[PDB]
Amino acid sequence: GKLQYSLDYDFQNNQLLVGIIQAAELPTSDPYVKVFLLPKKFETKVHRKTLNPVFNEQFTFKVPYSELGGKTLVMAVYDFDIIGEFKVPMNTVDFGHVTEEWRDLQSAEKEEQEKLGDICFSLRYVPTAGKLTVVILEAKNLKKMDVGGLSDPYVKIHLMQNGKRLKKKKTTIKKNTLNPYYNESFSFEVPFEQIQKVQVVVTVLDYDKIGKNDAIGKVFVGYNSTGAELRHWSDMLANPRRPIAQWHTLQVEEEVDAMLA
Template structure:
């Protein structure tokens, strides 16, 4: 048969015709259902990425003269093909936002902008190392904080001496008489081993204070000074007597030695007659005297992306002027990612410690940015000459503490409804001053 020898000599590499005779180098193939070329079958396999294994098998067996590719190599080629196909098919878009909210895009953390992208399996992040906008957590910093907290607890137990004073109430004049008698075993604050002590006396929540004379170079001063606080007898149960002991410094800030606080005057002594009292001076680095309170309401409109903070009033503010009063105003700063975006302030109220404002402050904040912003509220004392002084501050937001966080969450839970609360003012920290000023 000459035709059989000719066909065997010139065996085409793409011949899939059925028959018992095949090329000796070709592995046995099952006959296809129709007379279609193998290239068409491979093209159809590409359209279905989930069945890519069949495509690879067909592509491998196109050449009848090449040996079979190992199974592990085929699996790795299949995974690479799936990753590439899925990466080409997926597409991410960002929703359009209002022009007044565009300023938030450049201030929000980087993590918000890339979290929705699918980078494929080649860029999988280890579960133990989660990226954050501020970097990875450094355990040594927390160890340092733990050491500092231990030092502060040791200082709180430090002996700061004792103070002797007396209390008596005058029913005819409706006044409380406080007499600072003496102090014993005060700690040395100066290099020469002595101190220059004096005492400040408050009857809270009133901001009016009295101060004793300064006694030079002694750790056991004798004061014998009396002070009169006008107060009704029925109000004594709600008052607190606060005494702060300081060391006077002529050329620097006065050092605080410690403080004594009496919460309930009726339980402490019999006010009908003069009572002599001894108390240990508690260690403190700054006065824990109340700085006052501020009342404001919060209301958020999600559809308009508008936050309204209405400053209502303040009470019992700290006196910052020599006259015993202050010139307070309220400043509100919008903070995002550690940066101040905007600030607004109320009007100034002259010579008062209980100002009333009823002024609204409005910020435009998109709903998806509410979890990344915070409000810093500062009650300031206006000075015509020099810098304005901070009376007290407080913070609002999801990451705030205490009532500031609770008020913020309550506002988000009840949109379009004004919610008002009283907030105590706190001392400002150095980090907050760097951001706000």
């Protein structure tokens, strides 16, 4: 929101000083401020149920002028338990005189998506027939590869044994979505003597990135699986002839590949 601040560089000592005096036009909120020492941090005066705090606190940072506008200030004031957000590039500022101004940005920058998305599929295993069926049902919250592209997801299913890729399947493409629905069924001939040695690897890829780095994320179930993945595999084996559906969180391709090697 609205906010008065000061900015000073002391050339004799080689140090930058920013004042965080007053904030105005807030949405009540019990606030506190924090200094962004561009690539330390400062704990400012924490008000309590104050829709317009004051701090008059100065913040000193001993950076040489050879840093020359490379760094950049950022301040994100939080309603204590990030409502206020404003940033200033270190190279937009003339230190011929100290500066004091009102900035009023009341919107922060949305954090990059860390989770890769989730995939739901069913597993069925018929021991007598030695037949394993995977139904890719749906995926959701897929992480976008690049901003400003459009994502065209599809799924690969690999049946592995002893680290060898035995059989490979793929879904159709669903253009322009992060929440594809498939309901596509794939069958594998796996004799019950072998059913316990195999892994089923499930990868979600972006077709628009085919031929470069295109994997969004993956999981595997079966031999050496862990977590919710083993739990789904064991449910399948516990329930012969019956399809069992479960959600899975997608994991980082390089992490899972290290597990599969």
